[PDB]
Amino acid sequence: MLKKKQLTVLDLHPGAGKTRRVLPEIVREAIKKRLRTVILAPTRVVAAEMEEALRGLPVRYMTTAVNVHSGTEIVDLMCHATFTSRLLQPIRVPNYNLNIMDEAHFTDPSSIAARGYISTRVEMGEAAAIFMTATPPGTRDAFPDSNSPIMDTEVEVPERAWSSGFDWVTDHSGKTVWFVPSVRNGNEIAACLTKAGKRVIQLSRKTFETEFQKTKNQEWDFVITTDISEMGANFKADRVIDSRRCLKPVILDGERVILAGPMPVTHASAAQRRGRIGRNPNKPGDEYMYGGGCAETDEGHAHWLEARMLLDNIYLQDGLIASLYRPEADKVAAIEGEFKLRTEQRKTFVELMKRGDLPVWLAYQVASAGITYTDRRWCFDGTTNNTIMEDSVPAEVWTKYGEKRVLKPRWMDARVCSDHAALKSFKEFAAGKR
Numbered sequence: 001m002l003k004k005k006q007l008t009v010l011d012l013h014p015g016a017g018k019t020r021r022v023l024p025e026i027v028r029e030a031i032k033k034r035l036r037t038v039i040l041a042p043t044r045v046v047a048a049e050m051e052e053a054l055r056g057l058p059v060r061y062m063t064t065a066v067n068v069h070s071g072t073e074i075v076d077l078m079c080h081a082t083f084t085s086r087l088l089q090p091i092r093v094p095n096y097n098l099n100i101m102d103e104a105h106f107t108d109p110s111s112i113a114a115r116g117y118i119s120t121r122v123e124m125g126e127a128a129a130i131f132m133t134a135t136p137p138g139t140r141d142a143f144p145d146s147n148s149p150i151m152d153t154e155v156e157v158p159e160r161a162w163s164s165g166f167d168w169v170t171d172h173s174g175k176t177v178w179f180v181p182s183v184r185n186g187n188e189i190a191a192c193l194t195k196a197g198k199r200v201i202q203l204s205r206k207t208f209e210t211e212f213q214k215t216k217n218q219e220w221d222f223v224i225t226t227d228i229s230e231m232g233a234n235f236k237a238d239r240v241i242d243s244r245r246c247l248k249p250v251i252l253d254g255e256r257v258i259l260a261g262p263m264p265v266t267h268a269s270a271a272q273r274r275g276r277i278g279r280n281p282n283k284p285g286d287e288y289m290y291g292g293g294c295a296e297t298d299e300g301h302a303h304w305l306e307a308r309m310l311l312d313n314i315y316l317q318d319g320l321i322a323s324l325y326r327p328e329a330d331k332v333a334a335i336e337g338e339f340k341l342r343t344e345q346r347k348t349f350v351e352l353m354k355r356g357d358l359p360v361w362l363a364y365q366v367a368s369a370g371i372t373y374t375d376r377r378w379c380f381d382g383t384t385n386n387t388i389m390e391d392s393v394p395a396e397v398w399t400k401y402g403e404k405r406v407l408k409p410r411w412m413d414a415r416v417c418s419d420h421a422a423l424k425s426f427k428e429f430a431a432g433k434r
Contacts, residue, residue: 084110
């Protein structure tokens with residue numbers, strides 16, 4: 001796997017050993033060959049798990065998620081987004097001879113970016129790489145192998161509060177992980193289960209790194225999660241309920257981002273969701289209930305456009321622009337290099353994404369217009385149909401000038417107000433509070 005000019009797709013089925021068994025073997029061999037190696041974890045939660053599986057091995061953990069260091073480590077471990085972020089900023093990133101990406105199906109924009117950067121360096125003959133995932137880009141197998149057999153059942157899955165007609169959901173006495181299309185949809189199902197006496201934990205991107213510990217430290221009957229739990233999260237569960245639905249961010253007319261759907265999930269996503277159970281070879285008969293079919297709904301998905309925006313602003317070599325990883329490059333229509341920004345605008349672009357916590361597309365619109373990071377006038381001077389509503393009336397903030405104005409961004413991205421926490425953070429941004 002480790003010879004240069006080589007990208008390997010490690011596609012063992014879920015539970016097959018990739019992180020606890022294969023990754024330490026690869027790391028020990030890379031240390032022997034003095035290969036300067038990066039290990040890319042999708043989340044800080046998986047980083048901490050990797051430290052457990054890599055225990056003792058000389059690895060520099062470039063994350064505050066891991067409580068360990070000598071300084072004489074030639075293997076680095078950092079998060080997907082940390083790797084891409086460091087490539088975008090002045091900070092120098094080593095020319096790694098070996099690039100290991102765990103959970104390499106992760107569809108976050110900075111993970112697609114990182115896959116494109118890494119496969120380009122391999123195609124240039126400069127590095128080797130190993131992508132680890134049960135579900136490579138392109139799978140159409142939503143029912144891969146498991147450590148023990150799974151009962152698969154197609155069945156109507158409620159997506160709103162229900163009274164009767166779904167007794168199988170609440171009659172269950174084990175532990176269920178339930179994948180929902182959105183945080184808001186998860187809230188409504190959570191409330192319904194809680195009112196039926198169930199102990200519910202809710203997981204989403206903004207909360208995952210914090211609430212996941214509750215699945216270890218508390219009693220629970222249901223985990224209600226968005227697709228963030230497709231990327232390494234593991235549970236001592238015996239049932240998965242899969243609405244088989246997701247929201248799809250879509251750029252309309254190059255001018256706005258909407259959250260289309262809910263619509264079918266990909267096969268990869270369905271397999272990753274089912275893959276949370278049937279993992280214990282000593283406990284056959286875990287259940288997978290799925291409430292819809294799969295489709296290739298990553299085509300047109302804004303995350304691949306945003307991935308091009310990131311990769312267009314990472315230096316490779318004179319002029320050159322890294323392609324996306326070939327099997328996912330078709331998921332977006334874009335002119336390579338069309339998003340490259342000059343030195344100062346790239347800086348604003350990065351600060352908008354990092355400190356500003358804005359979606360990539362929105363950060364790009366603001367930065368390529370020449371707006372400096374702290375200048376929030378664009379949040380108020382959009383067209384009337386860009387008004388953001390809070391509780392059925394136009395949302396309002398006090399500007400940094402002390403003036404109460406309606407939230408009306410010049411570029412509208414539905415992800416900044418898709419749930420309450422998202423709207424709260426965007427209101428503080430528009431107020432100049434970060």
